[PDB]
Design a protein around this motif. Structure first.
Motif, PDB file in Angstrom:
ATOM      1  N   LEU A   4       0.900  -1.148   0.000  1.00 36.84           N
ATOM      2  CA  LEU A   4       0.000   0.000   0.000  1.00 36.84           C
ATOM      3  C   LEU A   4       0.933   1.190   0.000  1.00 36.84           C
ATOM      4  O   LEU A   4       1.625   1.462   0.987  1.00 36.84           O
ATOM      5  CB  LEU A   4      -0.884  -0.037   1.242  1.00 36.84           C
ATOM      6  N   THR A   5       0.954   1.893  -1.126  1.00 43.37           N
ATOM      7  CA  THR A   5       1.882   3.002  -1.310  1.00 43.37           C
ATOM      8  C   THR A   5       1.279   4.382  -1.412  1.00 43.37           C
ATOM      9  O   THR A   5       0.297   4.587  -2.115  1.00 43.37           O
ATOM     10  CB  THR A   5       2.730   2.756  -2.570  1.00 43.37           C
ATOM     11  N   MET A   6       1.901   5.336  -0.731  1.00 35.57           N
ATOM     12  CA  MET A   6       1.412   6.704  -0.742  1.00 35.57           C
ATOM     13  C   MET A   6       2.563   7.694  -0.832  1.00 35.57           C
ATOM     14  O   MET A   6       3.555   7.566  -0.109  1.00 35.57           O
ATOM     15  CB  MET A   6       0.603   6.965   0.529  1.00 35.57           C
ATOM     16  N   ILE A   7       2.435   8.681  -1.714  1.00 33.16           N
ATOM     17  CA  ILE A   7       3.477   9.697  -1.866  1.00 33.16           C
ATOM     18  C   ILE A   7       2.822  11.043  -1.607  1.00 33.16           C
ATOM     19  O   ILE A   7       1.852  11.394  -2.279  1.00 33.16           O
ATOM     20  CB  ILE A   7       4.095   9.691  -3.305  1.00 33.16           C
ATOM     21  N   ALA A   8       3.353  11.790  -0.640  1.00 32.35           N
ATOM     22  CA  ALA A   8       2.793  13.093  -0.274  1.00 32.35           C
ATOM     23  C   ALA A   8       3.855  14.147  -0.031  1.00 32.35           C
ATOM     24  O   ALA A   8       4.969  13.833   0.367  1.00 32.35           O
ATOM     25  CB  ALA A   8       1.940  12.945   0.967  1.00 32.35           C
ATOM     26  N   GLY A  13       1.519  17.876   3.507  1.00 39.40           N
ATOM     27  CA  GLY A  13       0.854  16.593   3.366  1.00 39.40           C
ATOM     28  C   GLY A  13      -0.028  16.410   2.146  1.00 39.40           C
ATOM     29  O   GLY A  13      -0.851  15.502   2.110  1.00 39.40           O
ATOM     30  N   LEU A  14       0.120  17.255   1.138  1.00 35.79           N
ATOM     31  CA  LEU A  14      -0.698  17.091  -0.053  1.00 35.79           C
ATOM     32  C   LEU A  14      -0.389  15.747  -0.724  1.00 35.79           C
ATOM     33  O   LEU A  14       0.769  15.429  -1.001  1.00 35.79           O
ATOM     34  CB  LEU A  14      -0.421  18.220  -1.044  1.00 35.79           C
ATOM     35  N   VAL A  69       9.519  15.241  -0.107  1.00 32.48           N
ATOM     36  CA  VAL A  69       8.462  14.310  -0.484  1.00 32.48           C
ATOM     37  C   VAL A  69       8.602  13.046   0.358  1.00 32.48           C
ATOM     38  O   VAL A  69       9.702  12.491   0.486  1.00 32.48           O
ATOM     39  CB  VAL A  69       8.554  13.899  -1.960  1.00 32.48           C
ATOM     40  N   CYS A  70       7.490  12.593   0.930  1.00 31.57           N
ATOM     41  CA  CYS A  70       7.504  11.396   1.756  1.00 31.57           C
ATOM     42  C   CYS A  70       6.994  10.202   0.970  1.00 31.57           C
ATOM     43  O   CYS A  70       5.872  10.218   0.469  1.00 31.57           O
ATOM     44  CB  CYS A  70       6.631  11.587   2.989  1.00 31.57           C
ATOM     45  N   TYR A  71       7.833   9.181   0.831  1.00 36.76           N
ATOM     46  CA  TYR A  71       7.437   7.978   0.116  1.00 36.76           C
ATOM     47  C   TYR A  71       7.119   6.975   1.212  1.00 36.76           C
ATOM     48  O   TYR A  71       7.996   6.588   1.975  1.00 36.76           O
ATOM     49  CB  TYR A  71       8.580   7.498  -0.781  1.00 36.76           C
ATOM     50  N   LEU A  72       5.855   6.575   1.298  1.00 37.07           N
ATOM     51  CA  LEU A  72       5.401   5.662   2.348  1.00 37.07           C
ATOM     52  C   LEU A  72       4.808   4.379   1.808  1.00 37.07           C
ATOM     53  O   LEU A  72       4.077   4.394   0.821  1.00 37.07           O
ATOM     54  CB  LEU A  72       4.337   6.362   3.210  1.00 37.07           C
ATOM     55  N   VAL A  73       5.091   3.269   2.484  1.00 41.85           N
ATOM     56  CA  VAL A  73       4.563   1.977   2.068  1.00 41.85           C
ATOM     57  C   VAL A  73       4.164   1.159   3.290  1.00 41.85           C
ATOM     58  O   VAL A  73       4.878   1.111   4.293  1.00 41.85           O
ATOM     59  CB  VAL A  73       5.611   1.188   1.208  1.00 41.85           C
ATOM     60  N   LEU A  74       3.000   0.541   3.221  1.00 46.99           N
ATOM     61  CA  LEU A  74       2.536  -0.278   4.322  1.00 46.99           C
ATOM     62  C   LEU A  74       2.511  -1.726   3.846  1.00 46.99           C
ATOM     63  O   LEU A  74       2.032  -2.015   2.743  1.00 46.99           O
ATOM     64  CB  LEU A  74       1.135   0.142   4.757  1.00 46.99           C
ATOM     65  N   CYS A  75       3.034  -2.633   4.666  1.00 43.75           N
ATOM     66  CA  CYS A  75       3.041  -4.040   4.296  1.00 43.75           C
ATOM     67  C   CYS A  75       3.035  -4.989   5.480  1.00 43.75           C
ATOM     68  O   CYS A  75       3.080  -4.559   6.632  1.00 43.75           O
ATOM     69  CB  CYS A  75       4.233  -4.336   3.390  1.00 43.75           C
TER      70      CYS A  75
END
Length: 127
Positions: A4-8, A13-14, A69-75
């Motif tokens: 589950l990936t999110m870049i903001a 936090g946009l 930029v924050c590169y986030l991943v949930l696993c």
């Protein structure tokens, strides 16, 4: 076995790009995962770690901060930490290269949906 990936954008936090949903996700979880992401973004500042792993039971968050930029991943907790960061690293270098100059001036959320495709393609290679 997910990513589950999110870049903001850190500053505010946009959201920029994302690939949350997976093969039949659960509305309950997906909502809680996204909300936890927001509370993470809103808190980010200059004093924050540029690389970080955050435990959440069966799930574990991993992210890096590069160029604001924050590169986030949930696993799954079980997923190799070292892998998650390579995944993130691949996303970063491609994202900054392709959108760094425009990232600090956009105002509409998900102004880089286009990048979703790259995230998807990059995902396959790891999972």
């Amino acid at each position: 076995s997910v990513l589950l990936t999110m870049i903001a954008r850190v500053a505010d936090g946009l959201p920029l790009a994302a690939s949350m949903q997976e093969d039949e996700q659960s509305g309950r979880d997906l909502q809680q995962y996204q909300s936890q992401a927001k509370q993470l973004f809103r808190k980010l500042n200059e004093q924050s770690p540029t690389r970080c792993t955050l435990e959440a039971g069966a799930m574990t968050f991993h992210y890096i901060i590069e160029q604001g930029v924050c590169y986030l991943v949930l696993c799954e907790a079980a997923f190799p930490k070292k892998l998650a960061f390579a995944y993130l690293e691949d996303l970063h270098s491609e994202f900054d290269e392709q959108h760094g100059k425009k990232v600090p001036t956009v105002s509409r959320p998900y102004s880089f949906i286009e990048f979703d495709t790259f995230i998807q393609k990059t995902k396959k290679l790891y999972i």
